[PDB]
């Protein structure tokens, strides 16, 4: 169906230990494809997907520029924000930028994003209309009004409607075997007695993509919010993800509970029993 491209930038200032360190990462849907580390040896944006290196030298020395410039901009921004709240040069602070775009099944445009954060808290964001911004604090108000003066939202808009959808299109069709893949969650149940009167049933869903998932335990088909446990979906370390959901059953009543797995790379929602 729909698809996404996100760029996550984090730059944290190292006071005393030279310059700030700066990390950036690119994702298409739930699949990373590029990397750059300030502490890296290559000092150049590296590939982590198999389809992105069919792009020639036109591209690596391009984005390496686009993003070292962003690195120095984030440095100066670290100083500016250090002054904005009367903060001390001794402390270590962080700046993070998320931006990207969404496409539909036809490759249409539906949404673009850009959000900034200072020390984990939101600073300034550009709204869904790509016209105005929101300022969380009152320093994001000076950054805001200054950006309204130079019409920065129009430049973030020409990017988000331009090359973000172009790049997302190109990458969607270029890693076609890898990016429109799925994996119907390989599921399996588990039974572990604790008392002579209670056990635990663990509904397992492993190897699935995209991360989107829904595990639901039911009793007599009644949704169970009571004695359950639900992990957060974990990366299985190989582009696919894992998850499980446990419930505590009175012994001899295991066959009254049913696990229901709702993955979308999968035609009909599952129902498992002991």
């Amino acid at each position: 169906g729909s698809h996404s491209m996100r760029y996550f930038f984090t730059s944290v200032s190292r006071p005393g230990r030279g310059e700030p360190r700066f990390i950036a990462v690119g994702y298409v849907d739930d699949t990373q494809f590029v990397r750059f580390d300030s502490d890296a040896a290559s000092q150049k944006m590296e590939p982590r997907a198999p389809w992105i290196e069919q792009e020639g030298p036109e591209y690596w020395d391009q984005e390496t520029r686009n993003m070292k410039a962003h690195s120095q901009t984030d440095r100066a921004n670290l100083g500016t924000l250090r002054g904005y709240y009367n903060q001390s040069e001794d402390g270590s602070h962080t700046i993070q930028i998320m931006y990207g775009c969404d496409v539909g099944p036809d490759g249409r445009f539906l949404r673009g994003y850009r959000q900034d954060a200072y020390d984990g808290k939101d600073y300034i964001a550009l709204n869904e209309d790509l016209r105005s911004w929101t300022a969380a604090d009152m320093a994001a108000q000076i950054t805001k009004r200054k950006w309204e003066a130079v019409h920065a939202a129009e430049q973030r808009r020409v990017y988000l409607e331009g090359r973000c959808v172009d790049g997302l299109r190109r990458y969607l069709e270029n890693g076609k075997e890898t990016l429109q893949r799925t994996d119907p969650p390989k599921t399996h149940m588990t039974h572990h007695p604790i008392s002579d009167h209670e056990a635990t049933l663990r509904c397992w869903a492993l190897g699935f993509y995209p991360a989107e998932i829904t595990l639901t335990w039911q009793r007599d088909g009644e949704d169970q919010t009571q004695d359950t446990e639900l992990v957060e979906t974990r990366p299985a370390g190989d582009g696919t993800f894992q998850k499980w959901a446990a419930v505590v059953v009175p012994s001899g009543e295991e066959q009254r509970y049913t696990c229901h797995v709702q993955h979308e790379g999968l035609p009909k929602p599952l129902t498992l029993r002991w």
Partner: peptide, 10 residues
């Protein structure tokens, strides 16, 4: 492709 980051100083 990322942005020609330019109108983005605080």
């Amino acid at each position: 492709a990322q942005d020609i980051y330019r109108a983005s100083y605080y």
